[PDB]
Amino acid sequence: DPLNDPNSPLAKRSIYFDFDSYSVKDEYQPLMQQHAQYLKSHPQRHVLIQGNTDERGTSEYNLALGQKRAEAVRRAMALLGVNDSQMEAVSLGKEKPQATGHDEASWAQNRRADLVYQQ
Amino acid sequence: DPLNDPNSPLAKRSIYFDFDSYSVKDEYQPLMQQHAQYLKSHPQRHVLIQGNTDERGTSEYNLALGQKRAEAVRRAMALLGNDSQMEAVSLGKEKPQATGHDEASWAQNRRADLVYQ
Amino acid sequence: DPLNDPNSPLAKRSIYFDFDSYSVKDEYQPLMQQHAQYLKSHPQRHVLIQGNTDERGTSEYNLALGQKRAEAVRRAMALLGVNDSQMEAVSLGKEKPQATGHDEASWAQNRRADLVYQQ
Ligand SMILES: O=C([O-])C(=O)[O-]
Numbered sequence: 001d002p003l004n005d006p007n008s009p010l011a012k013r014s015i016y017f018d019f020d021s022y023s024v025k026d027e028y029q030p031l032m033q034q035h036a037q038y039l040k041s042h043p044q045r046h047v048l049i050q051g052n053t054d055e056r057g058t059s060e061y062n063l064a065l066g067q068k069r070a071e072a073v074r075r076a077m078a079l080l081g082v083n084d085s086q087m088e089a090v091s092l093g094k095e096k097p098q099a100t101g102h103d104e105a106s107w108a109q110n111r112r113a114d115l116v117y118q119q
Numbered sequence: 120d121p122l123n124d125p126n127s128p129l130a131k132r133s134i135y136f137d138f139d140s141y142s143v144k145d146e147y148q149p150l151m152q153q154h155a156q157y158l159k160s161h162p163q164r165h166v167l168i169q170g171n172t173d174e175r176g177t178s179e180y181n182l183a184l185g186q187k188r189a190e191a192v193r194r195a196m197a198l199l200g201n202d203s204q205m206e207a208v209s210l211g212k213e214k215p216q217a218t219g220h221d222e223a224s225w226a227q228n229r230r231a232d233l234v235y236q
Numbered sequence: 237d238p239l240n241d242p243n244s245p246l247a248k249r250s251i252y253f254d255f256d257s258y259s260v261k262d263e264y265q266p267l268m269q270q271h272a273q274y275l276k277s278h279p280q281r282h283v284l285i286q287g288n289t290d291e292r293g294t295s296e297y298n299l300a301l302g303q304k305r306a307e308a309v310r311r312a313m314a315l316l317g318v319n320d321s322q323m324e325a326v327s328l329g330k331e332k333p334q335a336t337g338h339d340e341a342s343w344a345q346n347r348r349a350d351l352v353y354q355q
């Protein structure tokens with residue numbers, strides 16, 4: 001399965017965001033196109049889009065920002081043709097940092113939406 | 120004491136696995152030989168072999184796969200020479216070392232550790 | 237806000253310590269001068285100084301060592317003019333390691349005090 005091929009374009013699973021932004025940067029449109037093509041040619045595959053933030057700001061603010069990040073990715077893949085039935089969008093806010101330091105080297109890694117396939 | 124030396128060959132304590140595999144690759148036989156020699160020359164030293172998986176698949180499937188990984192390492196150590204110094208347990212996918220959701224993390228979590236007691 | 241400018245000297249947030257020491261090395265005085273200047277000119281800003289340790293020694297020992305590290309940074313910034321009402325010093329001991337390996341490089345990374353601004 002290309003989903004389990006570490007050298008497929010699908011091996012990249014994450015979209016990164018600028019500070020206090022849920023704009024999907026154009027440099028991630030190709031990645032979204034690749035995953036969209038996968039989902040449209042594997043109609044029983046479902047993906048969970050998880051939005052995350054860096055630690056700056058309240059838990060409440062970042063739950064909402066993470067949700068906008070996940071919803072922005074879901075919308076972009078919907079525009080690329082993915083049927084809504086194969087996607088869900090959820091927020092982890094700032095609660096599940098990947099990088100655990102307290103400067104921009106960590107925070108940039110945490111302003112992130114992940115495509116998590118149900119396997 | 121060699122298990123406290125960050126510079127000993129014994130400081131490497133992990134065996135890594137391919138996707139959905141509990142086969143111990145030949146490249147790790149030298150590591151296992153090193154720890155085997157240590158355990159055979161330190162008869163009261165015990166090791167807990169903990170098996171781990173990446174997050175893909177059910178919790179139940181991954182608990183069983185981590186167990187097979189730990190038992191394959193235990194078996195390979197036994198073949199290198201006493202069962203009374205080893206236990207094998209599975210953490211399934213529950214204790215990821217790398218917390219990301221792609222192969223860069225997952226490869227680090229398909230792993231059995233030698234945990235000295 | 238210079239506090240969110242990655243090219244500001246304020247971008248650096250961490251002070252690193254030698255084994256079993258809470259001495260603030262002189263190489264960090266310029267960083268603390270920069271954060272002191274920022275705090276003095278932004279009286280609404282509050283910073284939490286979080287002290288950490290590497291894994292060697294007991295939880296109790298390291299809780300206290302982490303506290304001495306955070307207090308050492310707070311005193312250094314107090315001597316640079318920062319009002320005590322804009323700082324708090326707390327300890328995470330060895331409970332929140334950044335680097336999880338068991339080697340000199342991981343240990344050095346965790347002998348650390350972080351300036352965490354409330355945002
Ligand atoms: O504002 C933030 O915390 C962000 O951009 O993740």
Ligand SMILES: O=C([O-])C(=O)[O-]
Nearest residue numbers: 138139172173175229
């Ligand atoms: O299938 C898995 O989750 C693995 O290989 O760890």
Ligand SMILES: O=C([O-])C(=O)[O-]
Nearest residue numbers: 255256289290292347
């Ligand atoms: O002794 C230690 O644990 C240290 O320096 O953090």
